[PDB]
Amino acid sequence: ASMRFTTEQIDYYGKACNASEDDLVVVKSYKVPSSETGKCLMKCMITKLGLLNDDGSYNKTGMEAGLKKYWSEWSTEKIESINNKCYEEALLVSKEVIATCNYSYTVMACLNKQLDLDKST
Amino acid sequence: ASMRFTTEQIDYYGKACNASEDDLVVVKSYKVPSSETGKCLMKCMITKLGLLNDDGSYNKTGMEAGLKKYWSEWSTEKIESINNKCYEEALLVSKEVIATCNYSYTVMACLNKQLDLDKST
């Protein structure tokens, strides 16, 4: 289990976020694109999904709703537990950090770690 | 379609390649780790899968065999077409480029672009 994005999602939010195809295939290769647009793609995508607020901060209720909508395979129990843990880590971040395009990857790393660790039933 | 790795593959080849969990969750978040070991993880993994030679260069027959093994939902015809194209691109790359850790991501990106252009098979 991981926070996988499908080809369809990548293609849709790639249009929404003005990515090139080269940006998109680099994302799908597990890498952050080097273009100006491509390095902010992830932020743009997960904001449009409601996982982040427009200021870039973790949105607790939006994250839950998005996980339930698109990553329901994780189970509601694990979703609630992981979301509480990652939100709690989010509280400790500065405004400066949240402003960057990289913060999105930080959040996703947290969700992926906690998914690797969570034992909720 | 993309050259997706499963959570189990990432875990296995993470052990094989001496990655830390923080490295692995950054890969699963679609980012290259900045650690010395982590930034080489992809290379190490796809070398162990036989897609690259031990010297880092593209292995035509090993790529075809890995495609057929690990991504067997794709037709032989699609596999051979993406392999031929991305091998042809590989022939133009220097020894200095193949020596890098990042070249692996470039190979993955080429395969991912050719996958996006051959969905009818």
Author numbering:
A (entry chain A), B (entry chain B): 1 to 121
From the paper:
There is good evidence that aphids, like other insects, use OBPs to transport semiochemicals across the lymph into the sensilla on their antennae and deliver the signals to the ORs, where a behavioural response is initiated. The OBP3s from both aphid species have a similar structure to other classical OBPs i.e. six α-helices connected by extended loops, with three disulphide bridges formed by the six conserved cysteine residues between Cys17-Cys44; Cys40-Cys101 and Cys86-Cys110. The two OBPs also have some unique structural features which are different from other classical OBPs. There is a significant groove in the surface of the aphid OBP3s (indicated by an arrow in Fig. 2) formed primarily from the N-terminal region of the chains and parts of helices α1 and α2. No significant internal binding pockets were predicted by CASTp37 or SURFNET38 for both MvicOBP3 and NribOBP3.
In the two molecules of the asymmetric unit of MvicOBP3, each chain partially occupies the other’s groove, with Tyr30 inserted deep into the groove, forming an inter-chain hydrogen bond with the N of Phe5 in the other chain. The N-terminal residues of the other chain cover the second face of the groove and these symmetrical groove interactions form the centre of the monomer-monomer interface. The two molecules are related by very close to a twofold rotation of 179.4 degrees. PISA predicts that an interface of this size is biologically relevant rather than being a purely crystal packing interface. The interface generates a pocket, which assessed by CASTp25 has a volume of 390 Å3. However, it also binds to β-pinene, (−)-α-pinene and (+)-limonene so this one OBP could be responsible for transporting all four components of the alarm pheromone blend of this aphid. The MD results of MvicOBP3 showed that Tyr30 is displaced towards the protein. The most likely explanation is that Tyr30 is involved in the crystal packing/dimerisation in MvicOBP3 and is relaxing towards its probable monomeric conformation more like that seen in NribOBP3. MvicOBP3 is in an open conformation (Tyr30 away from the pocket) because of the interaction with another monomer.
